[PDB]
Amino acid sequence: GLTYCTHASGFSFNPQTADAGTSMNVVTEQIYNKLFDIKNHSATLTPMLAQSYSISADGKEILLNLRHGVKFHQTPWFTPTRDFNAEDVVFSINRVLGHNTYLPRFPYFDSIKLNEKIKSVTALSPYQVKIELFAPDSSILSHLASQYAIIFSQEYAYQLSADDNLAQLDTHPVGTGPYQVKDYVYNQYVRLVRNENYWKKEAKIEHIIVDLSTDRSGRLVKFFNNECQIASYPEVSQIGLLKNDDKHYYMQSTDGMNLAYLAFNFDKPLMRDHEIRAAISQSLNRARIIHSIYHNTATVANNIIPEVSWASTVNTPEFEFDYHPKIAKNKLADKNLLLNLWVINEEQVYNPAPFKMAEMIKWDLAQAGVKVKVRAVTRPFLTAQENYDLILSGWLAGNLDPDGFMRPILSCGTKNELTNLSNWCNEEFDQFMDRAITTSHLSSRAKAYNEAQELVLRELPIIPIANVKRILVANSRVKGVKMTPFGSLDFSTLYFI
RNA sequence: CCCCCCCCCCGGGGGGGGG
RNA sequence: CCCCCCCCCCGGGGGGGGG
Ligand code: NA
């Protein structure tokens, strides 16, 4: 038996209804399968519930050849009568599109505008699905390779819709994953059991417990008390107490798309001025923030696309609007500015201490003659929308295709949404973005993505602060631990020595 | 229902090459 | 230890033929 301790923050049996760029769902990574997986810095489509695929010459039609003999979980709440087929695929994508499921808000898919990408998803055979596209999109299968594109049971959802019970789908799960849900208690624990009739090499550990109960501080406490074999997201100050010399535990870090940033509200006539935006950035000592907030578990970010992305062809050039308080003091002190800085009051994966950082920003800006008034704001209060002049947020993405993170944050389409906190719209940026998905080749795709990044770094719609590392601590008995920038953790590979 | 071919998938074992 | 080829075995699913 194995115990995985993590935060109760962001816990869901459905990453589809979850707010985008906030999590990597460790639970749905085990109980649900996608059609494909992408677990390499080359973005190779690993076949999962789809054995293979082919794209039409015009690029507007994708055909998916689904795996045979795949069965859904046999749980106390559901007992399947048939194998996985085209019907389960058709239901799952049509739900997120907003198309007919034929039964008695998806933040990620809304921000990437899936229904504007997909025309239709239809079953040709029980083991063949046809995807119609409005125009060629080289990002489609990468989005269907993401944590958000899990496949649900059509047989289960038909039975549930028969009694208005479709809410159960997210309370009592049924998937094809290597692990199965046994029992749980919300925000406390999840009890997983190995799926015996799995379509691939079976899970090595029969029983896994996902512990959500303990706080960030007492997580390493529970670990060293040996009631916890893998400890995820530990307290940042506690990391500097740990070592790589120990023969009883080891640490594993990973880089990826885990960005903390500051956005300018472009609904504020002052914030629409490039002069002040470039000066506010020059007033910020982002180097000093990395030590006080992250204690060497982060990189000062002068990029939007991580270096682990196939789209990173730029070797992160010097930032033109980096810390220089003298230039900042001149342009701002004489302007006599007072700005409302909002901070989302929640646990952030890209921010251990968001309010502490908001004080360091309030301090750095006062030196150059800018008055900052920080406000603790809730996620639904912001959704309701003195309005903010600056907001402190970020993005955590496993999908390293910049269509999945740069489009939600800076596109015109998402301007009046929670994803684009800058309320920015640049038709030249949307131009590069659109071009980057009409071309199928990496050379062509990375060129347009670097062009858009270069534009973002000069227009300054956001100030990138940190390149955050996701950390975990594991016991020496535990082998089969592989932390990747592409997703959460695969519990199938875990085993004791 | 049994026996035999072809195709795809999965798992295991063995030999060759690359980091 | 990971990734990839070749060979053999096993199991499952699908299509063709014989009793
Ligand atoms: Na918005």
Residue numbers in the entry: 35 to 138, 163 to 443, 449 to 560
Provide text from the study.
Important for NTHi survival, colonization and persistence in vivo is the Sap (sensitivity to antimicrobial peptides) ABC transporter system. The Sap ABC transporter is completed by two membrane-associated nucleotide-binding proteins (SapD & SapF) that hydrolyze ATP to provide energy for substrate transport across the bacterial inner membrane. The structure confirmed the classification of SapA into the Substrate Binding Protein (SBP) superfamily, as was predicted from sequence analysis.
Crystals were nevertheless obtained and the structure of the 60 kDa SapA protein was solved to a resolution of 2.6 Å. In SapAclosed, the lobes enclose a cavity with two narrow openings to the protein surface. Difference electron density (Fo—Fc) became apparent within this cavity during the later stages of refinement. Since the location of the SapAclosed cavity approximately coincides with the ligand binding cavities of other SBPs, we inferred that this density might represent an endogenous ligand likely derived from the cell lysate. SapA co-crystallized with a strand of endogenously acquired RNA coordinated on the opposite face to the binding cleft. The RNA crystallized as a double helix with parameters consistent for standard A-form dsRNA, with a radius of ~12 Å and pitch of 31 Å with 11 bp per turn and a rise per bp of 2.8 Å (31 Å/11 bp). Specifically, the guanidino group of Arg 101 forms a hydrogen bond with the ribose 2’ hydroxyl and the 3’oxygen.
